[PDB]
Each structure stands twice: as C-alpha cells, then as structure tokens.
Amino acid sequence: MENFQKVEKIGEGTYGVVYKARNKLTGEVVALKKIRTEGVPSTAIREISLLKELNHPNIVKLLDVIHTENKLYLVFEFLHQDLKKFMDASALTGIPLPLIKSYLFQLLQGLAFCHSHRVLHRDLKPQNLLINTEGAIKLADFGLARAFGVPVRTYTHEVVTLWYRAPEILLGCKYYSTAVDIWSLGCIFAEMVTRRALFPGDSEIDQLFRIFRTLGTPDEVVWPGVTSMPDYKPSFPKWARQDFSKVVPPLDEDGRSLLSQMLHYDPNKRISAKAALAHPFFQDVTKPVPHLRL
Ligand SMILES: CC(C)(C)[C@@H]1CCc2[nH]nc(C(=O)NN)c2C1
Incomplete structure (x- = not known):
C-alpha cells in the first residue's frame, strides 16, 4: 500500500503475497496480506470484516480489512x-x-x-x-x-x-x-x-x-x-x-x-x-x- 513501507516479503500465502510493513503513520509494524479480479465479491468481504471482532490472545489480531482498487488488504499484527x-x-x-x-x-x-x-x-x-x-x-x-x-x-x-x-x-x-x-x-x-x-x-x-x-x-x-x-x-x-x-x-x-x-x-x-x-x-x-x- 501507499501508507506503508515494505520491509520484507514475509512470504506468499495462498491468497496473495504477504509483506512485513511499517505504518508510516503510527510507526507500528504489521504483516500485510495483499489479495488477488472483476469487482470482488462483497459476501467474502463482510465475512472477513467480521473476523476483526474475533479477538483472543491465541488468535493473531486482524487489524483491518481494506478493499480498494480491486485489491483486498488484510492488516495483521506482526509476530516474529x-x-x-x-x-x-x-x-x-x-x-x-x-x-x-x-x-x-x-x-x-x-x-x-x-x-x-x-x-x-x-x-x-x-x-x-x-x-x-x-x-x-x-x-x-x-x-x-x-x-x-x-x-x-x-x-x-x-x-x-x-x-x-x-x-x-x-x-x-x-x-x-x-x-x-x-x-x-x-x-x-x-x-x-x-x-x-x-x-x-x-x-x-x-x-x-x-x-x-x-x-x-x-x-x-x-x-x-x-x-x-x-x-x-x-x-x-x-x-x-x-x-x-x-x-x-x-x-x-x-x-x-x-x-x-x-x-x-x-x-x-x-x-x-x-x-x-x-x-x-x-x-x-x-x-x-x-x-x-x-
Ligand atoms: C498470512 C500469514 C502469512 C499466515 C501471517 C499473517 C499475520 C502475521 N503476523 N506475523 C506474521 C509473520 O510471518 N511474522 N514473521 C504473519 C504472517
């Protein structure tokens, strides 16, 4: 994204590529997953967005779900x-x-x-x-x-x-x-x-x-x-x-x-x-x- 400074390519999940990124606006480092596309289903976006509320000490926090420019970004807390x-x-x-x-x-x-x-x-x-x-x-x-x-x-x-x-x-x-x-x-x-x-x-x-x-x-x-x-x-x-x-x-x-x-x-x-x-x-x-x- 434009709001981030890629640090490394954490990897490449099944759904897109994953990057370790620093929020050039909060300074916190996150794991940013970029998802693959003619419009993108909104059924899948509401289901994922619901995951943002699924917070537990043994679940990696899903910080944000952003759908923009035919791309779906998942912002996760970074673990080492x-x-x-x-x-x-x-x-x-x-x-x-x-x-x-x-x-x-x-x-x-x-x-x-x-x-x-x-x-x-x-x-x-x-x-x-x-x-x-x-x-x-x-x-x-x-x-x-x-x-x-x-x-x-x-x-x-x-x-x-x-x-x-x-x-x-x-x-x-x-x-x-x-x-x-x-x-x-x-x-x-x-x-x-x-x-x-x-x-x-x-x-x-x-x-x-x-x-x-x-x-x-x-x-x-x-x-x-x-x-x-x-x-x-x-x-x-x-x-x-x-x-x-x-x-x-x-x-x-x-x-x-x-x-x-x-x-x-x-x-x-x-x-x-x-x-x-x-x-x-x-x-x-x-x-x-x-x-x-x-
Ligand atoms: C989508 C995958 C690749 C499974 C993870 C999402 C959240 C995360 N947090 N730290 C990491 C991490 O890889 N730390 N080095 C990740 C990766």
Whole structure:
C-alpha cells in the first residue's frame, strides 16, 4: 500500500503475497496480506470484516480489512516467527515436550474460542501458526478460507499443502465442521513431536492413502456414512490400522491417547477443542519460553 513501507516479503500465502510493513503513520509494524479480479465479491468481504471482532490472545489480531482498487488488504499484527520456521530451526534437537504441550494447549484454547463463535479455520498449518518470544502461539488467517473457497494453487502458482487436511474434506464432504481444525492440529502436534510431517501427501489421493495406510482404511464400522461420501470409492485399498505406538514415539500415553482422539475418522467421534483442554495430557502444562532466533 501507499501508507506503508515494505520491509520484507514475509512470504506468499495462498491468497496473495504477504509483506512485513511499517505504518508510516503510527510507526507500528504489521504483516500485510495483499489479495488477488472483476469487482470482488462483497459476501467474502463482510465475512472477513467480521473476523476483526474475533479477538483472543491465541488468535493473531486482524487489524483491518481494506478493499480498494480491486485489491483486498488484510492488516495483521506482526509476530516474529511462524511455527514452520521454528520447527525447522529445532529440527536437530526437537522442540522440548513442555513447549510442544504449551503450544498445543494454547492452540486448543484459540480453537475453543473460534469454534464457540462458530468460526472455523479450515486451513491450519505450521505456516499459519505464529509464535512470539513470550511463549505464546497464535492462529492466523482464521475464517479466511471460508468466504473464498480454497484455491487449487496460490498467488505465485505454488502449491497448496494437503498434509493437514481432514479426511472428510478429502472425501468430498460438502459441509465442514469444527472437527476439521482439530484434525489439522492433531497432525501438527504429531509433527512437532516426531519432527516429520505425519501425512505428507503430494496429491489428494496420496494424502488420503497416506492417512489410510497409517490409521487404516475407514469403513462403516469406524466411520458411519463414509461409504456414501462423494469421493469415496469401494475400490480404495484396504489397509489395516497401524499400531499407534509406532506413530508418535516416544510421546507418552496421555499424549498418544489425546492424539488418537484428535485423529478419529468420524468427525463426530473426533474430540472437541474444549474437551481436549480437559484431557489428562494437560494436567502438568506450563508455559515455557522458546529460544528464538529473530
Ligand atoms: C498470512 C500469514 C502469512 C499466515 C501471517 C499473517 C499475520 C502475521 N503476523 N506475523 C506474521 C509473520 O510471518 N511474522 N514473521 C504473519 C504472517
């Protein structure tokens, strides 16, 4: 924008490019997302503008939504690092368990809030999770994919990651439930613990089959109505569920049982964020400070 001094290209989200910018009128530095266009739908703008009221300590504040010159700008509070970069930076040593637990806990808190307000994220991923030096982690781009419908690619024609996509989305479910975010967070929790993505699919079917290979091909027994889903094919290979202790070693039993609940196939059996906050895994949760290299 004309009111800002680009500092760096924070990155390039699925919807446009993101810039670290200083408000040459307030001096505060923000993350400025520029969105892609014959007029632009006002249905999507009111939905996003509603996100400005969704304020919580574990949600990146959406400062402004500006629609001008066929461009949509989203002004976000700036955090110094995303979880994907922090995980890469901790690749050799791994993120300490107390910090992983604190991060999971805070994210469930952020989700409990969004979901209690009927707002779903729909595209949770490490790059969407921002952390600060004080030990806080925050959800960002909350409710964005809603009024926009996830595009096959991004602005730079890169590639949308499906690694954190819930099985019902992959099977063509028309309606998303808050359960999709719990699934994504479960995948992230496992990745923080093991230092490797849980389901690194590079296509929709590869994603699906990677899920099936590990948790077993779902059927009417574990997931009623699954065989009636849009993209469900009776021809799907039938993989036996893998022993779970193999999925996230060496995570303890409490962590493992919570993760299994976050990864139940049936969205109805999948644990809610609120219930998860009461899980015994969080009996000794604390708030460690990360060692950040800014
Ligand atoms: C749209 C994406 C890219 C997910 C974030 C929006 C808000 C934000 N705040 N700090 C950051 C940040 O990347 N700090 N370095 C971001 C980025």
